[PDB]
């Protein structure tokens, strides 16, 4: 068969972060079909990674407050979370981040080991009150969208996010291509982290989608289907 | 729809064909709309880009009855319509129909675009409360999503030994994500870090200090991801609101919300939060079954209880000792508190998230008395005049009533169905009237300078509790111009005179203690045609000062018509109000004293004769009353109402002394305008 | 403080009423400069320019009133009350 | 209101010379009513461009 | 107990005979 | 239905009896004189309310005139089987049980005491020996419409008296199908309805065809039953009666032999079945609207066959003889292409709104020729063709097939009226589907219009692909009182999977009243709960546990009758599980397609001058006093102003705006109002002098006249 | 921590009809969305033929009868709408439907021309007697979705044509079931069970694989942006 009228993207840049990606016309009943699959797959499909544990040095019982430092554990837990780092090693890999005497510490002051790197260093973690330090050890592993914290000697594992995109909303709205007024108009709303654009993000999860419906085109290459023609 | 639309814009449309070049001649566009090619269509959605039309519902009743809106295309041939305008239509899609004009001159036009546009009329005229916010299934969806359930999933645990707390979340997209993936319930205890919402002032003014919040600024906030969520329809720098969302609490909230905002942002947030209620709706499991509808868990018990009674009275009447108006007043009286204690009972037994109750308790629609006339006890009911029936019905609605139950109960039905077409035609009537006898008022001058105006109790003080706010302070003095300066106990002044007393400046005369505040009101007003803007005040719709020009009277007139068809009954219904208007003597007269005095009553039958002696002299004003209706309170220290006409008891002037209703002319002679 | 407005909503009214003592003035205050407006479109072809076309430029095909309104809001306009 | 008969025959007796002036009476005859953007201080503004803009528009 | 033969059997959950049948209507 | 129901009316105004505003009060309420005699639930919830009623089932009128009611007598404590029937007078001495009380099986009453209606509207139970009379069936004080509401026992009198009245008001479908669950009288109902043919006498049917069906009796001798396809009703919906015996099939007398219109084997169908499921869907069901599947659309469940009669007459004038004739003058050939020999459409061409149906022309020989006009008729030898054309066209609004047309001819002497030569009837049809703005309602008055017609593919389905047909609202069932609904859905799923109560351990506790053949039932089984006798709750809780599991072998709906869906869009179940089951659903007669209407301009009226037409222009809506006080509130003078002077009385004004519309130019100033000037010019002929005064005390001629261009 | 197993499709054939198809692993709350896409892309978007007028000699529209036949035109009609054919060619063609004496006369007695096939000859059509004869000429074309008999209303053709309601429909029934494998460590995954019922016009997997191709091009508009 063909399309009445090939849908097209056409992408609006609201920030560096955001975007409104629109995708029109569609026929009557596609809109939703594309954007909710669409939206799971950009928000749990592209791959990441994300501090997974961390080891403060004098916490053993967690709930209390670490000395030298006005900052609790939970909000030292929170801080870190929002971390946005990008890792090249399928193995976990230990990263220390160490700091004596007053001052500030902030994400810019973690020595990374090969591979990993952190896209954010001017991120404040904490305050360090006078003669204060801290030693903790924070582990970041590769994954794919969101997870729980795993694992339930001091360890505290975290809720970890392995997406770099970390939220998204979409819009169906009615369109009219010459007297029909019922096609659809895809209205696509995401915002990724700094470590990937949105363009990238939506790429990804479209090349993904295409793939795991190969699939099911595999079956039989010789059925006839609907197809929008070359551009 | 596409064929109203173009048989009603047809020479608009004709122009514009010709200016395209589709057709040469206006014949030939006229044949081309009437055959109605294609590329009429592609016009069409062109000439009505900015065009408003108006939609009217008869019978219209009020202002907001005819209001005007953008037109948009639609296949079928129903005119669409939004959710929110169908309270102020106060129509309710069961088959009604309403017509559709159209404005043609450029004033035409701009009216209809500036003062009827349907986003203008939020408020109604006749009082400040919204008239278009969540109403029927939207409220039920926010209700759902703010609520808070204890032990939920995802649910703020304190760290124990080992494990640390669980439940904090670093902002909403991390809450949001959890809680697609299935381990967070939107309405679950938590402690999200919020970082675009202005926080609490409780909040604010501690974790921050009096410096001033900012966009950008963490947070933590003990809520549920359901009220995170909810909050962000609202508009930025509106304070986090972490209540339920009850039916009374989002009307606080619009009115705190278009009190303070531009009518764009009230119109706006109105829709978001339309939106989220229908989206939340769905996903609310708010249905109805015989699960759902529960019966009390004994019922045998309170039943054969006030049976006995009811026997009781049964024997001892069929022995001669009462009478029988007696035996129908004790049949009534154990029957209604029969009915009193099913409803208690019901009450006590129903869970919280039964939808049965959940429709009613979060104010959606409906209220417990019907909740009990279903799976409870429908109660007593009435014969065809209105005498209650001295045999109950002792059957709910879903246990099914017996055959000569159902017929008994036909009565009341039929009676209120043929007494509502009446109700209708006198509401019209007194509204007629009204309008015909204020169409005069008009707002004239800016400010007749008038120093003389009526004084209105703000809220009566008592020796325990000293300021104890009116039950009525929002609809006596809440949009009047003040109108001399609130002095207080001490030297210096609250609010000076020409204010707006509003809801800030009503809590600060609270706050200092004032009770008696003279304000001015078109009662005294100096002007000799109409009024002038500053003694009428604060306009309703508005919101702000009336404007010069505004035709007052109209809308005093259909406010007081509008509600005349919902309220139902010496008369206490329409008829009274109705009567009360016209002027005319009271059916139950009541006697008013004509001067303080010590009442010598005396008490004699077929005719009661009230003489009062004065307190400085004179005759004995005589009163040969009727002996039938009754005595009313008198105005000892006490002033309570368990209190009787005592004998000598003394009196103030123009005081009613027996219970009904003072005549007017009485009170204008005696007292005074 | 708000997210664009779209559709005659545009623009708003409570910007619209700070530059009009009230909202019967304004009505008349955009219906009347709408006239000249549309007078003018008319007049175009040939004659004289008394009547000045719209200050603002028009958007594709704006009606004469929604660019009287758009003007006003420009304060690209002034008037005397009677 | 009431008995049209006697109201007129009322009237053209005592040859009542009312004035058209009130909301009611300005709607039947087809005059622009004595309230909102009728009235006069509303219903004769002259707008025209301000200056500044007709200047820097040629 | 269907007075017309060609009836559609329904079963029913009526539990009190009829012991008049109903007239022409 | 309506017809049954129309020849069972009661009415009580019309001559000789109380007017409308006569009729105080008092009498249109009800009276404990009614039951048996005159229903109480059904009459029409207009203004007319009260004063029309129906006659209960077993109500039958005396010789003088006074309503009886059987009742049976008790000779001494005990039932008897024989009848007398007793009017209003010989009630009030006599003492009358009620028909729910319980009886032993010989007669004897099980209680003591029994509740009873004394002589004035008065129950009291009394001594078991006092009672003298017994009502004969609980169905005794419904009228027909009423009778056929299952579980009117749960519904509260304003609904019923809603289902009532709609159940008047459905249209005949294309295709009838028998509700799942509905009471006794669906079945006598139609039989005596006359819709319905019944065979005489006993026979063999020896040939059926789509026309007529003959029976051999047994007698020998032959009957044929002629049966009327696709005849229009009164009130326009069509009518058919399509045979149901087979050829060879033996048939006894009395049976039924073709339904008519409404009627599946013999018992009233006035509606399909719908797979409701109750909640609330995304506020495209808000406040009473209703949300269909598009399956209902394409497959025709809810389409209906609607016929129009246009009819037009020839008749002789002064001038000449009108005739229908095939030639009009200046018309092009396409326009006549459909047009048969003798003037008038052709069988099956499907015409439009604005096609010629009739060739009518008339003659106007006997008028003022122009002298131009006469001058060009010689100039090109052109015919003077004075005949006009009165061509008969369809109405705006109409299509359809041209199923048939008759043509009444005088000069064969067909008994025309006086003054006529021709007249020809034309039948157009149409065939109207289902689509937004129509109305739908169920049996207990839970009206609704159509809000939206979803795809298939969005609506919820059920853990099987099913998808519902049919979504409503749930705030709309408690507030209404009307339950009763739900328990027809949840009995009409059990009647459709068909259930299977456990009975090796025995019969179960709640199902001992059973009828002992009820204890089980196919999928799709026929189910009936007479009106006051039927199904307890306690029954339905039972038989919703006990359903047959579907054909994969998993049971959908859980024991309360609920079940968990999908969402349709989003893909993911709904988090609570949700109510499902079928509900028997009409289609009301208050369709879209008849209300809808616009003018832009169309003829005016002759002595008022105001907006008027008869489906050439729709015609104008009424603006009355209340819709111009409305605007004045506006403060919206010029709106007003418009609405009332420009278009809708001030010629000139009417005449010069459509001018300024069409061009550019702006919309020029009112008039004066034509309602005035006629006011004006008709006070000053009752000799009473009305000037129009202005400044300076000096009169305004009113009379002006200019001449444009 | 990733599952690198990308994705596997197996086919297991319940009936002619019936199959279902079994997808695993994917990503934890992501087997539902997936399922839900391809259920509403067979349902709409999976192209057929169905008959799309139907030319009865004798008979001028659809609200008659023709002698002999037991069931009016009406009916017919809606008999005739269950018919299901696969019509290779995409072109209106033709299909010719001659009987005449006493009987019943089924689907299978349509002679369908080279390309076109009845897959349900069983169907009853009508019912015949002696008297009477039935001669229907009717077309097939190939389509999708639901188009309404307005289509052919307009074509301008002789007034024998009776234009009918076409369904270019094969698939009947979907559904899925989200078999979770969630476990308390996080390595958990999904599995989609999607039961495919077709109407005897093609066989599952052809359905399958035509919804599947929809997608694959319809979402090749976002990889392509870049
Ligand atoms: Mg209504
Ligand atoms: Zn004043």
Same mark, same amino acid.
Request: net charge negative; hydrophobic share 35%; with cysteine.
């Given at each position: 068969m063909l399309i009445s009228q090939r849908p097209t993207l056409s992408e609006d840049v609201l920030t560096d972060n955001r975007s409104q990606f629109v995708i029109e016309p569609?026929?009557?009943?596609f809109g939703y079909t594309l954007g909710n699959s669409l939206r799971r797959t950009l928000l749990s499909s592209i791959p990441g990674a994300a501090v997974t544990s961390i080891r403060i040095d *004098?916490?053993?019982?967690? $709930?209390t407050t670490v000395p030298g430092?006005?900052?609790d554990v939970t909000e030292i837990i929170l801080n870190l979370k929002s971390l946005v780092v990008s890792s090249e090693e399928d193995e976990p890999v230990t990263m220390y981040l160490r700091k004596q005497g007053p001052g500030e510490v902030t994400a810019g002051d973690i020595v990374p080991p090969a591979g990993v790197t952190v896209?954010?260093?001017?991120?404040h973690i904490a305050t360090l009150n006078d003669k204060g330090k801290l030693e903790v050890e924070l582990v970041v592993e590769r994954g794919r969208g969101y997870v729980p914290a795993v694992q339930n000697i001091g360890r505290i594992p975290v809720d970890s996010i392995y997406s770099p995109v970390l939220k998204v909303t979409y819009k169906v709205d009615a369109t009219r291509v010459?007297?029909?007024?019922?096609f659809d108009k895809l209205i696509l709303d995401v915002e990724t982290k700094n470590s990937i654009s949105p363009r990238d993000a939506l790429a990804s999860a479209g090349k993904t989608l295409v793939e795991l419906f190969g699939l099911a085109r595999e079956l039989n290459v010789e059925a006839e289907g609907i197809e929008i023609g070359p551009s | 729809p596409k064929l109203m639309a173009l048989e009603l814009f047809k020479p608009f449309v004709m122009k514009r064909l010709v200016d395209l070049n589709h057709a040469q001649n206006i014949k030939s566009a006229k044949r081309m709309v009437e055959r109605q090619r294609p590329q009429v269509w592609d016009v069409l959605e062109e000439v009505i880009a900015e065009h408003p039309v108006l939609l009217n519902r008869?019978?219209?009743?009020?202002?907001?009855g005819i209001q005007a809106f953008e037109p948009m295309l639609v296949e079928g041939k129903a005119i669409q319509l939004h959710p929110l305008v169908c309270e102020a239509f106060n129509?309710?899609?069961?088959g009604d129909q309403m017509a559709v004009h159209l404005p043609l001159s450029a004033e035409a036009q701009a009216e209809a675009r500036?003062?009827?546009?349907?986003?203008?009329?939020? #408020?109604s005229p006749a009082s400040g409360?919204?008239?278009?916010?969540?109403?029927?299934?939207m409220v039920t969806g926010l209700y759902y999503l703010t609520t808070e359930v204890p032990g939920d999933t995802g649910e703020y645990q304190p760290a124990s030994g080992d494990h640390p707390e669980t *439940?904090?979340?670093?902002?909403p997209a991390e809450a949001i994500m959890a809680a697609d993936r299935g381990?967070?319930?939107?309405?679950a205890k938590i402690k999200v870090r919020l970082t675009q919402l202005r926080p609490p002032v409780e909040i604010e003014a501690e974790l921050f200090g009096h410096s001033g919040w900012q966009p950008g600024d963490a947070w933590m906030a003990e809520t549920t991801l359901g009220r995170v969520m909810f909050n962000?329809?609202?508009?930025?720098?509106?304070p986090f609101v972490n209540k339920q969302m009850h039916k009374k609490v989002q009307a606080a909230i619009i009115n705190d919300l278009a009190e303070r905002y531009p009518m764009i942002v009230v119109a706006q947030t109105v829709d978001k939060l339309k939106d989220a209620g229908f989206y939340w709706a769905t996903r609310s499991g708010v249905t109805v079954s015989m699960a759902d509808v529960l019966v009390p868990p004994r019922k045998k018990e309170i039943l054969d209880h006030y049976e006995e009674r009811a026997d009781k009275v049964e024997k001892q009447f069929q022995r001669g000792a009462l009478n029988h108006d007696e035996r129908n007043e004790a049949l009534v009286e154990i029957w209604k508190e029969a009915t009193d204690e099913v409803g208690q009972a019901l009450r006590e037994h129903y869970?919280?998230?039964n939808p049965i109750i959940t429709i009613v308790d979060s104010g959606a629609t409906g209220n417990f008395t019907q909740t009990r006339t279903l799976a409870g006890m429908k109660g007593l009911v009435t014969n065809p005049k209105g005498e209650f029936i001295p045999?109950?019905?002792? %059957? %709910?609605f879903r246990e099914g009533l017996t055959v000569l139950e159902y017929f008994i109960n036909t009565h009341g039905a039929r009676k209120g169905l043929a007494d509502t077409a009446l109700r209708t035609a006198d509401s019209g009537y007194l509204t007629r009237r009204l309008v015909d006898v204020s169409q005069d008022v008009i707002v004239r001058?800016?400010?007749?300078?008038?120093?003389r105006g009526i004084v209105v109790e703000l809220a009566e003080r008592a020796p325990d509790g000293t300021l104890i706010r009116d039950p009525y302070i929002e609809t006596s003095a809440y949009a009047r111009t003040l109108g001399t300066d609130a002095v207080d106990?001490?030297?210096?002044?609250?609010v000076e005179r020409g204010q707006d007393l509003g809801d800030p400046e009503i809590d600060a005369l609270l706050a200092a203690g004032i009770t008696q505040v003279k304000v001015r009101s078109?009662?005294?007003?100096?002007? %000799?045609?109409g009024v002038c803007a500053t003694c009428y005040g604060r306009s309703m719709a508005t919101g702000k000062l009336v404007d010069i020009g505004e035709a007052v009277g109209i809308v005093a007139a259909q406010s007081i018509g509008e509600p005349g068809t919902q309220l139902t009954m010496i008369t206490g219904g329409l008829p009274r109000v109705q009567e009360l208007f016209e002027a005319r003597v009271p059916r139950g007269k009541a006697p008013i004293a004509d001067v303080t005095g010590r009442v010598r009553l005396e008490d004699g039958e077929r005719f009661y004769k009230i003489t009062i002696v004065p307190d400085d002299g004179g005759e004995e004003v005589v009163y040969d009353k009727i002996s039938k209706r009754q005595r009313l309170r008198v $105005?000892?220290?006490?002033?309570?109402?368990?209190?009787?006409?005592?004998?000598?008891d003394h009196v103030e002037v123009?005081?009613?002394?027996?219970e009904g209703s003072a005549d007017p002319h009485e009170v204008l002679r005696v007292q005074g305008p | 403080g708000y997210d664009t407005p779209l559709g005659?909503?545009?623009?708003?009214i409570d910007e619209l009423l700070d530059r009009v003592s009230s909202k019967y003035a304004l009505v008349i205050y955009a219906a009347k400069r709408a006239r000249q407006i549309n007078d003018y479109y008319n007049q175009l072809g040939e004659?004289? #320019?008394?009547?000045?076309?719209?200050?603002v430029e028009p958007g594709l095909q704006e009606k004469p009133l929604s660019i009287a309104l758009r003007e006003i809001h420009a304060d690209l306009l002034e008037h005397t009350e009677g | 209101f009431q008995e049209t008969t006697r109201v007129l025959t009322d009237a053209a007796i005592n040859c009542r010379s009312d004035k058209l002036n009130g909301l009611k009476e300005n709607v039947i005859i087809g005059?622009?009513?004595?309230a909102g953007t009728g009235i006069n201080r509303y219903r004769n503004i002259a707008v025209q461009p301000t200056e500044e803009a007709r200047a820097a528009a040629y | 107990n269907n007075s017309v033969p060609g009836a559609p059997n329904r079963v029913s959950f009526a539990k009190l005979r009829e012991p008049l049948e109903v007239p022409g209507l | 239905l309506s017809g049954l129901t129309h020849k069972r009316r009661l009415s009580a105004?019309?001559?000789?009896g109380l007017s409308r505003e006569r009729a105080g009060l008092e009498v249109r309420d009800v009276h404990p004189?009614?039951?048996?005699?005159?229903?109480?639930?059904?009459?029409?919830?207009?203004?007319n309310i009260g004063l029309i009623g129906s006659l209960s089932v077993y109500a039958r009128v005396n010789p003088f005139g006074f309503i009886e009611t059987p009742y049976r007598k008790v000779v001494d404590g005990v039932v008897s089987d024989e009848i007398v029937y007793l009017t209003a007078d010989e009630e009030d001495r006599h003492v009358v049980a009620q028909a729910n009380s319980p009886i032993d099986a010989?007669?004897? $009453?099980? /209680?003591?005491r029994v509740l009873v209606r004394r002589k004035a509207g008065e129950v009291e139970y009394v001594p078991?020996? /006092?009672?003298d009379y017994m009502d004969?069936?609980?169905?005794?004080?419904?009228s027909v419409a009423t009778?056929?509401?299952?579980?009117?026992?749960?519904?509260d009198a304003n609904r019923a008296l809603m289902g009532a009245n709609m159940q008047r008001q459905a249209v005949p479908l294309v295709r009838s199908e028998a509700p799942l669950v509905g009471t006794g009288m669906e079945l006598r109902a139609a039989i005596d309805a006359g819709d319905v043919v019944v065979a005489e006498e006993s026979g063999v049917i020896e040939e059926v065809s789509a026309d007529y069906i003959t029976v051999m009796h047994d007698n020998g001798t032959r009957r044929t039953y002629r049966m009327r396809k696709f005849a229009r009703s009164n009130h326009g919906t069509c009518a058919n009666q399509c045979p149901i015996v087979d050829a060879g099939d033996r048939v006894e007398a009395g049976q039924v032999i073709a339904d008519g219109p409404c009627t599946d084997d013999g018992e009233m169908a006035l509606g399909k079945n719908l797979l409701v499921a109750i909640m609330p869907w /995304?506020?495209?069901?808000?406040?009473?609207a209703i949300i269909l599947s598009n399956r209902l659309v394409e497959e025709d469940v809810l389409t209906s066959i609607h016929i129009e009669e246009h009819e037009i007459d020839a008749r002789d004038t002064k001038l000449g003889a009108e005739e229908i004739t095939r030639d009009i003058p200046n018309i092009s050939d396409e326009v006549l292409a459909d047009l048969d020999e003798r003037g008038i459409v052709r069988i099956g061409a499907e015409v439009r709104d604005?096609?010629?149906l009739v060739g009518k022309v008339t003659p106007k020989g006997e008028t003022e020729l122009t002298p131009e006009e006469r001058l060009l008729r010689a100039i090109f030898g052109?015919?003077?063709?004075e005949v006009r054309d009165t061509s008969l066209k369809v109405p705006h609004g109409e299509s359809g097939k041209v199923i048939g047309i008759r043509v009444f001819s005088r000069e064969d002497e067909?008994?025309?009226?006086?003054?006529?030569?021709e007249l020809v009837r034309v039948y157009v049809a149409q065939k109207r589907k289902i689509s937004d703005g129509d109305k739908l309602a169920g049996r207990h008055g839970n009206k609704g219009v159509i809000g939206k017609i979803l795809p298939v593919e969005d609506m919820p389905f059920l853990a099987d692909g099913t998808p519902v047909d049919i979504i409503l609202n749930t705030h709309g069932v408690p507030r209404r009182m009307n339950i009763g609904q739900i328990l027809e859905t949840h009995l009409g799923w059990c009647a459709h999977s068909g259930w299977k109560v456990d009975?090796?351990? *025995?019969?179960p506790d709640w199902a001992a009243? #059973?009828?002992?053949?009820?204890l089980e039932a196919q999928p799709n089984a026929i189910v009936s709960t007479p009106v006051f006798d039927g199904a307890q709750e306690a029954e339905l809780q039972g038989l919703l546990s006990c359903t047959l599991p579907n054909?994969?072998?998993?049971?959908?709906?859980d024991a309360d009758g609920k079940a968990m869906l999908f969402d349709g869009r989003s893909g993911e179940p709904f988090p609570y599980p949700v109510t499902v089951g079928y509900m028997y659903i009409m289609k009301l007669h208050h369709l879209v397609d008849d209300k809808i209407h616009a003018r832009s301009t169309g003829p005016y009226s002759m002595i008022t001058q105001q907006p008027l037409g008869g489906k050439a222009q729709f015609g104008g809506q009424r603006f009355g006093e209340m819709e111009c006080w409305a605007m004045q509130a506006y403060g919206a003078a010029y709106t007003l102003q418009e609405l009332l002077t420009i278009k809708s009385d001030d010629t000139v004004g009417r005449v010069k705006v459509y001018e300024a519309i069409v061009k550019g130019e702006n919309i020029p100033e009112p008039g004066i109002p034509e309602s005035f000037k006629v006011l004006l010019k008709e006070l000053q002929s009752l000799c009473l002098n009305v000037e129009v005064l202005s400044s300076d005390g000096a009169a305004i001629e009113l009379r002006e006249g200019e001449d444009e261009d």
């Open positions: 569609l026929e009557p009943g *004098g916490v053993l019982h967690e $709930f430092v006005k900052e896209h954010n260093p001017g991120m010459e007297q029909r007024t019922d | 008869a019978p219209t009743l009020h202002r907001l129509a309710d899609f069961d500036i003062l009827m546009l349907s986003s203008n009329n939020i #408020l409360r919204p008239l278009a916010m969540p109403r029927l299934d *439940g904090v979340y670093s902002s381990v967070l319930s939107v309405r962000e329809l609202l508009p930025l720098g509106y869970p919280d998230d045999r109950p019905v002792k %059957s %709910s001058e800016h400010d007749c300078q008038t120093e106990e001490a030297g210096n002044v609250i078109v009662l005294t007003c100096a002007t %000799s045609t $105005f000892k220290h006490e002033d309570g109402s368990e209190r009787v006409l005592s004998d000598g123009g005081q009613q002394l027996m | 005659i909503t545009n623009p708003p004659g004289i #320019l008394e009547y000045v076309g719209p200050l | 005059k622009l009513i004595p | - | 105004l019309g001559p000789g004189s009614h039951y048996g005699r005159m229903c109480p639930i059904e009459t029409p919830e207009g203004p010989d007669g004897r $009453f099980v /209680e003591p078991s020996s /006092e009672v004969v069936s609980p169905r005794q004080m419904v009778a056929m509401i299952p579980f009117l026992e749960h519904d /995304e506020g495209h069901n808000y406040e009473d604005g096609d010629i052109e015919k003077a063709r067909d008994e025309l009226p006086a003054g006529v030569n009975a090796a351990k *025995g019969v009243r #059973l009828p002992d053949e009820l054909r994969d072998g998993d049971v959908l709906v």
